[PDB]
Design a protein around this ligand. Sequence first.
Ligand SMILES: O=c1ccn([C@@H]2O[C@H](COP(=O)(O)O)[C@@H](O)[C@H]2O)c(=O)[nH]1
Ligand SMILES: O=c1ccn([C@@H]2O[C@H](COP(=O)(O)O)[C@@H](O)[C@H]2O)c(=O)[nH]1
Lengths: 215, 215
Amino acid sequence: VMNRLILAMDLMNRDDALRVTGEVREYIDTVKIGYPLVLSEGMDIIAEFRKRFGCRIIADFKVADIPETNEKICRATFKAGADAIIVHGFPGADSVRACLNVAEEMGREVFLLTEMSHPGAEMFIQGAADEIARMGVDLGVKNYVGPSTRPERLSRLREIIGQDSFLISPGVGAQGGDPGETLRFADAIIVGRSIYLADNPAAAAAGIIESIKDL
Amino acid sequence: VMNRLILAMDLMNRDDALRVTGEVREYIDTVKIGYPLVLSEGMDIIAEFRKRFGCRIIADFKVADIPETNEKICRATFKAGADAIIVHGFPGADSVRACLNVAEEMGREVFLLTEMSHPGAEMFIQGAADEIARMGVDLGVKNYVGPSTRPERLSRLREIIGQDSFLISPGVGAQGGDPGETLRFADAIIVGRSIYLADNPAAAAAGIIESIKDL
Ligand SMILES: O=c1ccn([C@@H]2O[C@H](COP(=O)(O)O)[C@@H](O)[C@H]2O)c(=O)[nH]1
Ligand SMILES: O=c1ccn([C@@H]2O[C@H](COP(=O)(O)O)[C@@H](O)[C@H]2O)c(=O)[nH]1
């Protein structure tokens, strides 16, 4: 990922989303698009980005349904041009395998979300997260998401999935996570608001990378 | 809910979705719309349904993000005209409260999904589900979703949330659940494929209600 930095583009206005992404394109090669933007502007926004900016697109859809519905969601998402989709592991192995099957059919990738970054993740997810990660290894998942806000957890995740798996991490900036500390364990950081709500998104992104390189 | 029967409209084609929903409208007053249809045809499909059919719309979006993103998802969903949204409880209380706050602002309702109906739900969700339901009671949630495929679980859910809460239940038909058994505990059943993949959806729906009335 260019500069180890993935933009979380959660503005809900196409014009704002396009402005900010264009302003920071020199600093990233991947954009994470989620439901705030897609449910406001349509799934066609994925192909517009991917084309306009040349970027890869991770669809952060947190897929969390039964297997049959998960396959439909994944196939709609890959048809729209996403390169990868983020899947919850808490629904269990059949639900994840459904996503993996569609990704295999369509030449795309699944990222498994194993522990979330917000405080409420401590209630139920955290106690299951090591076992969710192990499930992912046993299913052949190679791409994972874990929390910048808890680097000790992020370290344990890395220790379960090994060095060859790819690990991305949200919660940097607005949620309190630190770029350099997170990159001790994650391959790339996800950053949303610290960039897209900045008075100068490009300067915000540049400053983060100046940190990353200094690693 | 008319006839205690909610249609899960997971066809991915607007013309097919409209045909089937129109054919069974005499039997239901609520349609559950999810990501298979919305991510194929756009969020505008909600207002088209709600208007064309006069029905209420439950958005089965399984909202499962951090609090800030959950508020955005909910506000986009209610702006599109949904009457209610289904929220996962596994992300914890802050994530649920975010949804409740937007629902309060916009005069809408939240349904809390506490145990899922598919086999993989046994791995992580089931062991947390009673505590997820209790969390919902403590947050003031009045509307719940639990599994037709496990009526003993559905009974335990009902025992936690009490008789005055509203409980709907998927997994009837294709996943193996039974209408009459489920309605011992749930107020309404959700049915998708057994209706929408039938050679005669209206006859399928009529037959289910003939069962329900016979209760
Ligand atoms: O555990 C997770 C999973 C995904 N996200 C997503 O990553 C982004 C974080 O953005 P921000 O906090 O940098 O604005 C948002 O899209 C959010 O939905 C998290 O924050 N935490
Ligand atoms: O635990 C849950 C939560 C929601 N759904 C949804 O309810 C519907 C079940 O449809 P069917 O199995 O009757 O086709 C689908 O939309 C599915 O995504 C479940 O099946 N189980």
